[PDB]
């Protein structure tokens, strides 16, 4: 849920292009460097929106906690034997959710 909320906030400032620009921003040690538009948009979120760095840090920490909690939950389900006759399909759905979460986090931080 927290991931959904913070991602909806983040989509209002991100520009996903791969065209090249020169920075010309506030972060001085990178002025004049040629970069893509996505990298510049992320820098603008970090340094020029009041409270943007906080929000993207919450987003990343929530992704990490999502993955860790899924793994601990799977460990519980496996060791207590809660996957037997009436619930194999629920186990299968959980496995698919795990795979999707992995690849979603990957695509996200890339």
């Amino acid at each position: 849920v927290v991931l959904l909320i913070t991602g909806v906030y983040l989509t209002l400032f991100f520009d996903p292009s791969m065209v090249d620009v020169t920075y010309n921003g506030v972060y001085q040690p990178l002025r004049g460097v040629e970069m893509s538009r996505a990298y510049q948009s992320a820098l603008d979120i970090s340094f020029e929106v009041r409270g943007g760095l906080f929000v993207r840090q919450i987003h990343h920490w929530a992704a990490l906690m999502f993955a860790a909690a899924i793994m601990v939950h799977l460990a519980r389900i496996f060791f207590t034997g809660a996957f037997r006759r009436p619930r194999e399909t629920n186990w299968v759905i959980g496995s698919l959710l795990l795979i999707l979460a992995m690849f979603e986090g990957y695509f996200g931080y890339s």
């Binding site: 849920v1 927290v2 959904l4 991602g7 906690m65 207590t80 809660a82 009436p86 619930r87 399909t89 629920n90 759905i93 959980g94 698919l96 959710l97 999707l100 979460a101 979603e104």
Partner: protein, 55 residues
């Protein structure tokens, strides 16, 4: 996110209509569920846990 949301909905529905499992104990059988009702208690504990995780 759309696929994950659909699968999470299906997961929680299956858990809701196939009632939860439990550990063996004093009054526990394969035919009953011993715990607390949703009405006063369970929603309260769930919401408090949500707030603590957000914190």
């Amino acid at each position: 996110p759309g696929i994950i949301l659909a699968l999470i909905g299906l997961h929680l529905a299956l858990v809701w209509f196939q009632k939860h499992t439990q550990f063996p104990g004093p009054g526990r059988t394969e035919h009953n569920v011993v715990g607390v009702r949703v009405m006063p208690v369970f929603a309260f504990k769930s919401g408090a846990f949500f707030a603590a995780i957000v914190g």
